[PDB]
Amino acid sequence: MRVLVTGGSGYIGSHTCVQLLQNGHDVIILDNLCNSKRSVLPVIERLGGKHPTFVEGDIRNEALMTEILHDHAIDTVIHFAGLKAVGESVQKPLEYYDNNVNGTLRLISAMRAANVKNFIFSSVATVYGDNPKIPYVESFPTGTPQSPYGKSKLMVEQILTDLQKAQPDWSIALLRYFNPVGAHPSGDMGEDPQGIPNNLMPYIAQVAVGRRDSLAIFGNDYPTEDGTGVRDYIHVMDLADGHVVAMEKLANKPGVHIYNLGAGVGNSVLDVVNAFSKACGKPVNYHFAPRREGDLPAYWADASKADRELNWRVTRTLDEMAQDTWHWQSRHPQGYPD
Amino acid sequence: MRVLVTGGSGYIGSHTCVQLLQNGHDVIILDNLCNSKRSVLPVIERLGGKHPTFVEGDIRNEALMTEILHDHAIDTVIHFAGLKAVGESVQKPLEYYDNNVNGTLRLISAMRAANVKNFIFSSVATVYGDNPKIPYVESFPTGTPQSPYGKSKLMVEQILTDLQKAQPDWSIALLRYFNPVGAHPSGDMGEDPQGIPNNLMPYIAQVAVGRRDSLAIFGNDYPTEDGTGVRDYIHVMDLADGHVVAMEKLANKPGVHIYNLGAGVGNSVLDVVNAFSKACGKPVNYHFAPRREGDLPAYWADASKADRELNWRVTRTLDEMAQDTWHWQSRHPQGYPD
Ligand SMILES: NC(=O)c1ccc[n+]([C@@H]2O[C@H](COP(=O)([O-])OP(=O)(O)OC[C@H]3O[C@@H](n4cnc5c(N)ncnc54)[C@H](O)[C@@H]3O)[C@@H](O)[C@H]2O)c1
Numbered sequence: 001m002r003v004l005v006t007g008g009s010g011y012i013g014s015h016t017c018v019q020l021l022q023n024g025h026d027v028i029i030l031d032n033l034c035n036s037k038r039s040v041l042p043v044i045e046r047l048g049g050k051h052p053t054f055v056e057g058d059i060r061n062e063a064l065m066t067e068i069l070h071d072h073a074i075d076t077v078i079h080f081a082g083l084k085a086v087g088e089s090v091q092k093p094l095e096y097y098d099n100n101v102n103g104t105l106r107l108i109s110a111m112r113a114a115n116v117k118n119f120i121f122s123s124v125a126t127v128y129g130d131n132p133k134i135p136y137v138e139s140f141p142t143g144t145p146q147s148p149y150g151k152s153k154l155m156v157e158q159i160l161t162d163l164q165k166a167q168p169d170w171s172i173a174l175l176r177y178f179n180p181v182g183a184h185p186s187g188d189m190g191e192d193p194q195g196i197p198n199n200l201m202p203y204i205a206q207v208a209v210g211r212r213d214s215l216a217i218f219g220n221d222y223p224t225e226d227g228t229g230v231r232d233y234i235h236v237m238d239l240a241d242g243h244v245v246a247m248e249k250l251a252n253k254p255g256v257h258i259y260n261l262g263a264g265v266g267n268s269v270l271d272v273v274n275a276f277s278k279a280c281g282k283p284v285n286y287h288f289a290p291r292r293e294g295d296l297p298a299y300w301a302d303a304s305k306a307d308r309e310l311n312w313r314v315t316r317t318l319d320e321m322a323q324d325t326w327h328w329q330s331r332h333p334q335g336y337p338d
Numbered sequence: 339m340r341v342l343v344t345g346g347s348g349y350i351g352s353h354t355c356v357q358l359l360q361n362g363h364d365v366i367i368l369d370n371l372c373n374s375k376r377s378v379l380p381v382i383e384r385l386g387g388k389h390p391t392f393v394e395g396d397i398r399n400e401a402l403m404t405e406i407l408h409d410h411a412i413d414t415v416i417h418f419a420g421l422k423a424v425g426e427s428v429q430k431p432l433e434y435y436d437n438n439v440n441g442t443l444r445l446i447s448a449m450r451a452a453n454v455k456n457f458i459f460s461s462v463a464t465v466y467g468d469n470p471k472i473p474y475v476e477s478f479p480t481g482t483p484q485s486p487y488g489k490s491k492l493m494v495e496q497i498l499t500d501l502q503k504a505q506p507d508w509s510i511a512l513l514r515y516f517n518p519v520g521a522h523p524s525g526d527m528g529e530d531p532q533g534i535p536n537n538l539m540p541y542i543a544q545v546a547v548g549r550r551d552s553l554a555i556f557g558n559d560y561p562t563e564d565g566t567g568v569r570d571y572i573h574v575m576d577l578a579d580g581h582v583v584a585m586e587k588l589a590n591k592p593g594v595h596i597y598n599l600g601a602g603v604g605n606s607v608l609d610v611v612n613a614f615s616k617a618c619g620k621p622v623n624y625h626f627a628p629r630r631e632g633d634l635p636a637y638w639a640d641a642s643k644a645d646r647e648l649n650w651r652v653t654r655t656l657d658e659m660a661q662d663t664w665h666w667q668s669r670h671p672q673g674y675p676d
Pocket residue numbers: 006007008009010011012013030031032033034035036057058059060079080081082083084099103122123124125177178179180199
């Protein structure tokens with residue numbers, strides 16, 4: 001199929017693009033490069049074994065969006081573009097609402113104009129809000145995210161829902177991601193954060209590579225097996241795969257298809273640390289710190305639905321998540337070249 | 339004060355502007371005229387006894403917004419602009435999200451750019467969602483509105499909240515309106531809907547004036563005193579007044595000040611009908627129809643807070659609401675001139 005992948009040069013999108021090309025789809029990436037570099041493009045092509053067309057631009061640019069859509073005869077759009085730094089969203093709410101909420105509305109408005117009606121949205125587990133019931137099931141009603149970032153995702157999901165209802169021939173997937181980690185097995189593509197990484201894995205990776213002193217473990221008094229926070233880590237390659245599948249199986253299938261993308265199991269901060277130490281051949285340095293603001297103690301996905309309906313499930317392990325990360329981190333300590 | 343009133347030429351805004359001028363404030367109205375006419379301007383000036391500067395434009399136009407804000411040295415902004423037809427929002431979700439959500443974000447982004455930090459937002463009771471607890475109190479947590487229109491208001495309230503938190507010197511009032519009705523006592527300004535009116539009052543008014551046959555009463559089996567739906571009707575003049583007060587007393591007072599704007603009492607469809615029959619000197623024709631989709635049986639505001647904190651409360655009665663409406667309807671059956 002002809003697919004436009006916004007945010008295509010970012011973390012999850014690049015991996016997604018590789019898998020997409022591998023499946024012989026025609027890929028058009030649209031990214032504004034606020035959190036990615038042009039240097040990843042050649043890697044995508046290489047690893048994907050096919051050329052993806054790149055367009056520098058902003059989802060907020062309705063007209064451009066509309067033009068692309070038409071120019072490339074797109075059949076479906078995978079929307080990864082946006083801002084996602086939680087803490088920062090607290091400090092800069094407008095930018096999040098603008099990039100994410102207005103960003104998506106401009107994009108879907110362009111889609112409407114161009115007659116495109118198949119969409120895949122990058123959502124988040126946070127939409128479940130403070131749910132005591134874990135694992136989290138798609139049949140649960142959403143709650144209220146604590147950060148503007150989370151709010152923004154929930155808002156988009158709602159907008160998309162209403163849109164579908166009003167334009168019923170639309171096929172829209174709301175992919176609720178849990179905690180993406182890992183890197184392409186080649187060790188030549190992976191997550192490349194700028195500055196202090198906010199997620200656990202990359203932070204650990206930075207400590208291991210000698211860039212950081214110690215990992216601060218946000219709280220050790222949770223009502224968890226080891227007192228550290230528990231999450232549902234999912235390898236970026238599995239995520240990528242789930243995207244291809246969702247795109248291929250839901251294209252032209254009217255409705256709002258919601259699926260939790262996770263391994264369906266939880267792992268502690270300690271569990272992750274240990275896996276990493278093992279992967280990089282040395283004990284990762286860490287210390288206990290106070291709980292982070294708004295942090296939940298533990299949650300993970302119920303991924304039966306995706307299994308059942310899309311025949312999709314994770315195949316990579318936690319060790320692999322760690323190994324792949326270390327490989328990329330270690331082979332390219334400066335990440336993507338400027 | 340110097341105040342920018344978006345949506346100033348509309349229903350609630352025009353009345354608000356009159357009251358504002360009467361209090362000697364400098365008013366700049368910004369409206370795109372999608373649901374109002376230039377013909378109301380001269381009426382505002384007349385009734386307000388002072389000239390308000392008018393600017394035709396769209397809140398979505400950040401740059402313009404920013405320019406106005408600066409050009410006019412605005413001190414505070416009253417934001418009434420947006421789309422509000424519930425049913426239509428179900429049918430055209432994008433336009434609502436765009437006008438309301440993106441619309442407000444562009445406006446507050448312009449405010450930020452111009453250094454303006456006092457805002458008043460037109461909110462809705464629907465934000466309380468399906469709350470069994472009535473009357474509705476500001477201390478209640480919000481729920482989930484059933485229409486994109488309602489969702490859009492809730493989204494804005496959230497965005498504004500986050501913004502305030504990140505820019506703490508901002509003063510933002512979230513005015514939750516209940517059911518505005520009525521008209522300026524002069525009978526020369528009032529609500530001028532185009533096409534089939536969606537609210538009860540105007541519809542009744544149209545029946546009375548001979549334009550409509552019968553009023554359809556949406557359901558007569560509610561668990562209410564008379565089986566008809568109950569609401570908190572509030573005279574547009576009271577609403578207007580509450581806006582002036584809120585603006586004058588909250589300007590430069592950091593925080594998110596939320597207030598329910600209602601009379602604090604409920605009235606049935608029948609109650610309203612009867613009041614109107616009385617006002618126009620003839621029985622209003624009506625019939626019982628099935629319940630409307632998503633209609634709640636009864637709700638009204640708890641307005642103690644505004645009383646307590648702003649010393650504000652309604653002064654107009656239901657009869658006056660009816661009388662004023664009929665007066666405007668009857669004196670200007672074609673509404674505002676093209
Ligand atoms: N990474 C996670 O843990 C996590 C968890 C759940 C949800 N998500 C979501 O998944 C998506 C992808 O996340 P990611 O990890 O790849 O982050 P990322 O930063 O790597 O990917 C986002 C990309 O989109 C681009 N972009 C940002 N705003 C844009 C705009 N207005 N116009 C055009 N391009 C724009 C950035 O340049 C970047 O390449 C995001 O929408 C994110 O919110 C990620």
